[PDB]
Amino acid sequence: YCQKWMWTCDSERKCCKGMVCRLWCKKKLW
């Protein structure tokens, strides 16, 4: 699974595209 908006990511766990990978998955505003 890709990490959803209410999820978080890691070096392995990636957030779903459209969001940015960070401590938590954050929507790409920029």
Side-chain angles (χ1 to χ4, degrees):
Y1 302 94
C2 57
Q3 303 299 91
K4 299 178 63 175
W5 77 286
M6 63 176 63
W7 293 12
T8 57
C9 67
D10 182 76
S11 310
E12 305 182 86
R13 299 182 297 139
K14 295 182 176 181
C15 300
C16 307
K17 299 179 181 179
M19 290 179 296
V20 296
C21 190
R22 187 53 52 216
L23 295 175
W24 76 98
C25 296
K26 178 172 70 66
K27 58 181 183 180
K28 185 171 178 57
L29 185 64
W30 191 94

